[PDB]
Amino acid sequence: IVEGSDAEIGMSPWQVMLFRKSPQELLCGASLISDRWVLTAAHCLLYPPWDKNFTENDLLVRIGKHSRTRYERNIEKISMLEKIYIHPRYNWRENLDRDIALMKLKKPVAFSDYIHPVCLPDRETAASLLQAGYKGRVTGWGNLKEGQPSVLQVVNLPIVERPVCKDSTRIRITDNMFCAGYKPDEGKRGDACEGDSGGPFVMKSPFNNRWYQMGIVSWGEGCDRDGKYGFYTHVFRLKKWIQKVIDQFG
């Protein structure tokens, strides 16, 4: 996260770290949506151009964390993966269309002050909240500039009008994406960066005070560049796939 700040304790209890076993290292962010299911970006797991094709046993998820590098004894929980599910129409060849994947955990995780699932939007919450100028929140342990943070970083960013997103990049954007960030000379900045992929873009509903995951950190060109914006997987647009996977595997 660029131009963010340290998260408060328990501020994002759905935040998940994707962790490589050998060598031990952060891979990506992710999010907790139930005691057995974790949401992330497909390109965190499968991206042939970078020779990235992880299998279940390559990976752990670490839940309830704050420090990036410490083993947070009596706070974090470390889970093994039962199964990885990648969207069948994930387009890694072209533009990361449908950049979404689910990971089912071997055992249910116990909730705590530091571990708690985020909500997924329904059509009414999506239509109400996903509007240009409305702000969401992105969290992660990724790079601080285009080094690395001691603890989880947070930044609040406005959703951008779709024509501005389109005109900011030569990459083809789809209805399964949205973009967010400040326009140049608006007086504020901030962006996700490498290592934040797979983490959640969340919004707090003013109707019921619940946090909803509207997006997944997906792609960008540089980090925090003027006139560029971060792109996010549109979670509601892929909700039917999410439900199909969960309503057929557990």
Binding site: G10, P13, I33, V118, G133, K135, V154, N156, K204, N209
Partner: peptide
């Protein structure tokens, strides 16, 4: 999931974090 999106250290005890007001103010 019945209790999704409500944080133990914030919503559950009616405490607000330091910047969530910035989000609420943006929803016009």
């Amino acid at each position: 999931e019945a209790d999704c999106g409500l944080r133990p250290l914030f919503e559950k005890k009616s405490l607000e974090d330091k910047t969530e007001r910035e989000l609420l103010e943006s929803y016009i």
